[PDB]
């Protein structure tokens, strides 16, 4: 329409040279080799599950409407519709990707109705492989497996009487009178919906995103919780570049992507359209008004009202890592165009555990249930980011690089002396002896381990600067959160300074 060229108009309208298309085809070839795509069959199986889910959404609404003494024609007209968002919505999902699904219902259909009626309607089916309703998440959701496909299901209820099949959620007004949770549920689809609408060629955009997703995950800079961009972040970033080069191939895009983003005058934010305004008393991203927004280091703003910063977590250290990976990209993709390097080069696994002379090892323990460790450790994990910030600001610390994948492991811990022992360094549970009588019964002890790469300023001081305060603190805050956490009988947290030379063998597996 015009907005497909971004807020600065394109950088160049030039088409792709025959040579550039050759490199683009080889790029897609590599992606295929990496099994990025799925088979026409598996795609067809997702279309089918969704088709059924739509059928169930209508049935859900219809049934609830009837119980409200509605006409046979009105219960039908009340409608009910299914929307997707996430990986599948953008068309960059993979063989094992789940399908994030939003269910929209009229005013008279409540969330309670959702976990009751809709749920029951799901169970009344053969294809239901399993259901894990978690009604109290930040965004109420019902997680299920259907016909061998994972489906995330959240429910949004609009302040209107009907939800027709034609309804699209672009209108800013659909948000009227909604509550925090419903409002939160609409945002996902509204955002992915706009991304696809602000890009010149959605197909060029998809291949380039698959590449960036792969790349980011291999270079260990794809994890929102640790201060790196998440999926939506990476997507908007690719789209901003697709905007700049309307008719280039995905290959030239990845190159311009790395160059521009590494030279970008951060914290100038990246946006796909002019930040809008509106009704709701809700805050919109605005660094002039809100301090919290003035501190975002690399802002990537969502286009759908109300605009938020998808990269809030980024710190000064992860910021450096990200620039570093961008630079390595300028260098490698420039080589791939000179015929001196290949795409596989670009997608090479990182070497986190080989690059620093020291590391901070954080381990969370749990002598209890699988749900207790998932909770405890899930807390520590989320807080690691705070430590990176306390750490990267002290004396002479050049960087505090948080790795992005904790190391999980549990042991059959029968005694008490066995617990207050496995955390001093006892049969390593395994996918082999997991459901075996003797094992499956045995009480367990879990532990999740995380690392922070450290680089001390090689200035010329007599000695490195002790990081005891920040560490002990991080411990405290992590315990001082719940009464159960500050126990010691079930939960434990330890931090050990480790030289690159003494890293655990499991870290290189
Ligand atoms: N902390 C969060 N707050 C709000 N929305 C979130 C948060 N974390 C994830 N999301 C939403 O969840 C959506 C689905 O993500 P998820 O299913 O985990 O992966 P995806 O991004 O769809 O990739 P795969 O499904 O892994 O290919 C995408 C995003 O809009
Ligand atoms: N704001 C949000 N909108 C939609 N889904 C969300 C969400 N926050 C979390 N989720 C769900 O949480 C999972 C990813 O963290 C899958 C995704 O559907
Ligand atoms: Mn998903
Ligand atoms: Mn999901």
Swiss-Prot record:
Effect recorded for residue 224 to A: Reduces rate of adenylyltransfer by half
Compartment list: Nucleus
Cofactors named for this entry: Mg(2+); Mn(2+)
Site (Interaction with RNA): 138, 143, 292, 312-313, 385, 390, 473
Enzyme class, first EC level, given as a word: transferase
Keyword Transmembrane helix attached: no
Binding of ATP, residues: 85-87, 97-100, 152, 213, 222, 231-232
One Pfam family per UniProt: PAP_RNA-bind
CDD domains: NT_PAP_TUTase (cd05402)
Cofactor annotation remark: Binds 2 magnesium ions. Also active with manganese.
Main subcellular location: nucleus
Gene3D superfamilies: 1.10.1410.10, Beta Polymerase, domain 2, Poly(A) polymerase predicted RNA binding domain
One term under GO cellular component: mRNA cleavage and polyadenylation specificity factor complex
GO biological process: mRNA 3'-end processing; sno(s)RNA 3'-end processing; termination of RNA polymerase II transcription, poly(A)-coupled
Binding positions for Mg(2+) 2 per the UniProt entry: 98, 100, 152
Keyword RNA-binding applies: yes
Residue list for modification Phosphoserine: 438
InterPro entries: NT_sf, NuclTrfase_I-like_C, PolA_pol_cen_dom, PolA_pol_NTPase, PolA_pol_RNA-bd_dom, PolyA_polymerase
Note: Present with 17100 molecules/cell in log phase SD medium.
Subunit structure comment from the entry: Component of the cleavage and polyadenylation factor (CPF) complex, which is composed of PTI1, SYC1, SSU72, GLC7, MPE1, REF2, PFS2, PTA1, YSH1/BRR5, SWD2, CFT2/YDH1, YTH1, CFT1/YHH1, FIP1 and PAP1. Interacts with FIR1 and RRP6.
Function: Polymerase component of the cleavage and polyadenylation factor (CPF) complex, which plays a key role in polyadenylation-dependent pre-mRNA 3'-end formation and cooperates with cleavage factors including the CFIA complex and NAB4/CFIB.
Family as reported in the entry's similarity comment: Belongs to the poly(A) polymerase family.
Name of the protein in question: Poly(A) polymerase
